[PDB]
Amino acid sequence: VPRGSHMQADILDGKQKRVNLNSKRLVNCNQVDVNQLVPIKYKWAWEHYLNGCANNWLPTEIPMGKDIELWKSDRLSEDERRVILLNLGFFSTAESLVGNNIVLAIFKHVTNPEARQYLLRQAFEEAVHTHTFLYICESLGLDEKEIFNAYNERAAIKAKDDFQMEITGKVLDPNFRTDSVEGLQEFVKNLVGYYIIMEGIFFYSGFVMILSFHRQNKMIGIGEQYQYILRDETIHLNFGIDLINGIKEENPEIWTPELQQEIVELIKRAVDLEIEYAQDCLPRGILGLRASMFIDYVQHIADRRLERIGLKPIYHTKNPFPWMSETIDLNKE
Amino acid sequence: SGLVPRGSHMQADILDGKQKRVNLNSKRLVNCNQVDVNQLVPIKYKWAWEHYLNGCANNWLPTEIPMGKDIELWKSDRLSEDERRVILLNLGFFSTAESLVGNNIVLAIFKHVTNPEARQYLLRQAFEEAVHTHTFLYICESLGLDEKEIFNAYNERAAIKAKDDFQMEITGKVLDPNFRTDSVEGLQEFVKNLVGYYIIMEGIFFYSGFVMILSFHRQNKMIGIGEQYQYILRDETIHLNFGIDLINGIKEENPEIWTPELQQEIVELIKRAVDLEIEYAQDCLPRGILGLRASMFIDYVQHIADRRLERIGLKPIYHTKNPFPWMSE
Ligand SMILES: [Fe+3]
Ligand SMILES: [Fe+3]
Ligand SMILES: [Mn+2]
Ligand SMILES: [Mn+2]
């Protein structure tokens, strides 16, 4: 390289602020400069970021003409409409709950620039997901306030989001810190609540309901949007699992039998709430969909989430939706 | 526009829940605790939603832009020491500036912008800052620069540090866990943060840099870097427009905060930013390069400062001409 290809320092004291890769930590890292991306330590976080960036899509790119025609017709049963409406109601605000939590709760305490890069991509993706639900409401001529207010008006939805508020913990409190054992444990419970429970269990169950319509060639515009959402959420979940496991590895003292058991109990509570939600969606069942299938499915996926964070499966049920894993394989990171 | 079909309404089983549906006229940009901030609808601030849609339409990645010709030129003796200095100082400053801006959106601004459509835009903007950060890593890796030397520039170069230190100062107490915007004093402090990041950092401190880098691009030098900066400029144009709309919106809804005292303080902050940016330009350009001299930046930085002032309802103060009119093409 030619002469003059280096920045010359005129503050010699400042070279000390260059970041030692091995000093970097996922949480509680105040000893190095968090504003400098380099050198990247958590290559897994950066890879998630690059993968997410390659997945750009917008709901407005997906035509809704056939969906509008079907929705406005008399072809759908009231029970079919009920599944769609309840799913829209729950997702319309749940995306914002997730996005707001990334920004208002998680970001401050993930003291690492490459992980934060991913968080910014994820949060933007949640904004895209929120746009999706606005777009669907406007396209089909739904009462947008009725749909977006569903979590205040439908008990089985409220129950899930009230639980979400509970497991959010005090992470939003101005006094909240992660530099105690109890504090970092509370933080990890928040991560489990959002990545494992909301994104990894509540959302996957909604995906089955909606994609079951897509597979029947009903509401294929909504279906396609949900396929893109599933592709994003696959990465959200993978990142969250990696982050939880990373925090555990770097802070083994938090991973007590007590914390482990509580995480199991939260997942159990999520499973029960999602089953009750599925029953509210499907009081009689529709073509290809019964509540009993969600009992097995929700238990199955909960076992898969438990395994990924080093906990034993507890339900041992089989997956009644083998095709979900087919589209999951196609939408794999 | 077809008829609403029978059975197409979601039935409530919590009868009083309907009261939490959001009244459009109750929404506000700050201090809005009377309605549910989680529900996007109904959208009140159309300008915020439009910025969001515009940003989303602007997707790009630095890895899409070929660096072959740039690598070839960087290896050659066809780029002078002085030209290299301009490039490296700009890479040094921008490499961390993007993170400063992005971190401030998330850690300072988002909590206090109590409006979902504006928050939708903020998430787009913060992601764009991540793309800009990626851009500087990609440039470093492409040209084989010492990445730690580049990203640490704001700790190693006085003229860069001076800008970023001033930035830390105008960030104010907004990061204080117990900072609140629900007083005149609190909201004025918040507005100073918005001026500091949108107007000063994004609207002024990026501009000598844009001119310098795009000057190379216009001479067919480092066109890979140039193209990346063109995409950054496109994004930053929206960032600035959103910030101006946000500042003006907060003023309109809370006119009592916009005192002669605050107005004077903002002008003085902008004057100081101008001085610091002129000094930075001087550091970049101890000697002239083609179509670029440090003295030109006196006129330019003052000219853009006047333009920013006008946009937030303040009188221009410098009255200088723009030596780089091609920046508006
Ligand atoms: Fe998600
Ligand atoms: Fe910006
Ligand atoms: Mn989502
Ligand atoms: Mn930027």
From Swiss-Prot, chain B:
Which Gene3D superfamilies does its entry note? Answer: Ribonucleotide Reductase, subunit A
Assembly state and interactors?
Tetramer of two alpha and two beta subunits.
Instruction: Give yes or no: UniProt keyword Transcription regulation.
Output: no
Job of this protein: Provides the precursors necessary for DNA synthesis. Catalyzes the biosynthesis of deoxyribonucleotides from the corresponding ribonucleotides.
* A biological-process GO annotation: deoxyribonucleotide biosynthetic process
Give the family from UniProt.
Belongs to the ribonucleoside diphosphate reductase small chain family.
Name under which the protein is recorded: Ribonucleoside-diphosphate reductase subunit beta
Q: Domain of life here?
A: Bacteria
Q: Which positions does UniProt annotate for Fe cation 2 binding?
A: 129, 202, 236, 239
* One of the record's GO molecular function terms: metal ion binding
Gene assigned in the entry: nrdB
Q: How is the cofactor bound?
A: Binds 2 iron ions per subunit.
Enzyme Commission (EC) number: 1.17.4.1
Keywords from the named record: Deoxyribonucleotide synthesis, Iron, Metal-binding, Oxidoreductase
Top class in the EC scheme: oxidoreductase
Catalytic reaction annotation: a 2'-deoxyribonucleoside 5'-diphosphate + [thioredoxin]-disulfide + H2O = a ribonucleoside 5'-diphosphate + [thioredoxin]-dithiol
